[PDB]
Amino acid sequence: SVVELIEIESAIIQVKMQDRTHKNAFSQELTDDLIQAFEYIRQNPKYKAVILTGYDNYFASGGTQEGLLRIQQGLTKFTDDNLYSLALDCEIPVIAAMQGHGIGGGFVMGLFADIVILSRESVYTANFMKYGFTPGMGATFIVPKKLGFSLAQEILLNAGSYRGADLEKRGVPFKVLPRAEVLDYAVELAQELAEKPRNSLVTLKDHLVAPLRDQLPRVIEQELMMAEKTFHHEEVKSRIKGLYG
Amino acid sequence: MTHSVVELIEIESAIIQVKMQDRTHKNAFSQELTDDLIQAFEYIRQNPKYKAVILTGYDNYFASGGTQEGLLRIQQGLTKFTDDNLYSLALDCEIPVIAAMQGHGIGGGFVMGLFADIVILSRESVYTANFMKYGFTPGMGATFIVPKKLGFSLAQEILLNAGSYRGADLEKRGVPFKVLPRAEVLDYAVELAQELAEKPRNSLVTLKDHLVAPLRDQLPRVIEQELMMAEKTFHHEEVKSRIKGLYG
Amino acid sequence: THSVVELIEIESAIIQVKMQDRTHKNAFSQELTDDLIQAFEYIRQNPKYKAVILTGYDNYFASGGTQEGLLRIQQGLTKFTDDNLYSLALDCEIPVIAAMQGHGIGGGFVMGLFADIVILSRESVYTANFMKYGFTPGMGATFIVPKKLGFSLAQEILLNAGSYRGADLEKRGVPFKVLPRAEVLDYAVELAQELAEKPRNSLVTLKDHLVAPLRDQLPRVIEQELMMAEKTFH
Ligand code: NA
């Protein structure tokens, strides 16, 4: 296992991503272990709040270079095995404690969490367009939904990198803390969430995210239409070989 | 007004101030406050000379939300959130309403103020959509107006976790509302009312109709969905225990 | 044609549109109206560019309707009609960066709100000031202001038509980058460079998706704005 599962207190579960070899890029291993961790959480009605973090300086790094090339060649899609919507499909609140870097799909996956916390010193980017890819994995839905239309245009079109400190200065609604405090803060917030009845938490998450769960599939189809027009050029293959990490 | 817990003052010829002054209940929705507030907005409706309304509290309180008895009657299913439509007073008013939140804004109190066209917070005061502390899902259109005014994301946190925030905390979090020291909040709302009053009433009524038409339109359905939520969560014994145990 | 707009090619893939009607302080004269439309047409006919920087001169980004034009409306004489300048950045096929190095007033502020990336100057003044003149807002203000600045700050901006410095907006948490004036255009140039690193067809395809709901919904909002304007001459 490359994802460890740590109960905190009575009803909090910490899904810690730790594929150290790949810096939390979506290796086959990290993919399957995440699916399994969330299926385990789905099957176990004790938990009231999930905390999803990485290890050391990485939250989640996005597609592996091979994984991206497989996408370029059309062997796979960004939406496979639904990694992208794990936190949205989870029935209890999920806090994405992004204590390290969040890159590409790694950032987008965390953005479907109900609560996202950033580290001041780490890097965040929705970097699809750096390779020529129009954004995938619901990025064109969840980036404006969480960060607002205007910041999303810049983030998505330019694919630039931002320190959590830069995003805090642009007015993001996410709590931004020094790396060393992100998990501690997440844990406190998780304990406050765990004070509520599980039924009230699920009933309210259902209702708050109903528009998302309703609209997302149509936004995915739209990204799939964009992807049909942009993903499959030779230039995209060159950008992936030439500019990956 | 009738109960004398709302004070109406004409600040200038076109500016009307609705001061909530239920000292006994700290501007919690007592029967008296409920009655006086409706009578006050109905007076505003019947006198179409004003251009701006300033909604404010007294001292350190803006509005405290349901009384403890009031919350207990809701969980026994004797009454509802909507019921008198207090939540939607500022949205129904045809002229712009400034919620001058000089003091604390709790529960249905906070929410009612967020339905104003302009909201101003006090730095030293406390704001909370605290329904969930008691085990209740939010009512009073909280799940519509809080995302609408503060954005989706900060709404998830405010609503799910029911925390308390000083106006400075919200300010630090990036809200769009002006945040000022308590002692400046009413002065600033008056200066703002005076600027609004530089316009023809008819432009102001016409513009607000256009701007809030999606809210007047969408709100009824969200109220429905929140009632449905209330049916699954409001009526357990543990809500009664949290109300009796965690405050009025 | 009128020389009140200057086009500079920054690199092959970057075009700078510089508003330069010094007599009118970049207010919407006939010359600046024509020239801007002719500049957006030239850009449309030349698919070599990947990014557009729209900017002003000195302390002026764009000043909106002219004193004269507004006065003529206030007393119908006439035509409350729609010139469609406000959407040049929206209809432009490639990303537009509004580098508002100077003041952005009324329809000049709004025109730049329809750009994909907006940059403000701390020192400059910004206002959707339609209602100062007794008018409900036009040119899509009531759509693009909430969309770019959030429902709440838009209610304030459009109802009261107040003036805000860059600095005030930044303290209220706007998502636009805010810089001292002397740094606004250089920062636009760098961002335009980063954008030009992308294949053009990726820029266009994404932009089309991102702004579809704005191109789709805008005409109805314009109809509503013309309605409101009609109801005001009671
Ligand atoms: Na899940």
Residue numbers in the entry:
A (entry chain C): 4 to 248
B (entry chain A): 1 to 248
C (entry chain B): 2 to 235
Per the authors:
Assays were conducted using WT PksI, along with the point mutants PksI-H230A, PksI-H235A, PksI-K80A, PksI-K232A. Of the four PksI mutants investigated only PksI-H230A was found to be catalytically compromised, with barely detectable activity for 3-methyl glutaconyl-SNAC and significantly impaired activity for 3-methyl glutaconyl-CoA. Surprisingly, PksI-K80A and PksI-K232A both display catalytic activities akin to that of WT-PksI, with no evidence of functional impairment. In tandem with kinetic assays, the crystal structures of PksI-K80A, PksI-K232A and H230A were determined. These data thus imply that the observed kinetic effects are not attributable to global or local structural reorganization within the enzyme as a consequence of the amino acid substitutions made.
In this study we present a structural and functional description of the bacillaene synthase β-branching enzymes PksH and PksI. These biocatalysts are responsible for the final two steps in β-methyl branch incorporation in this PKS/NRPS pathway.
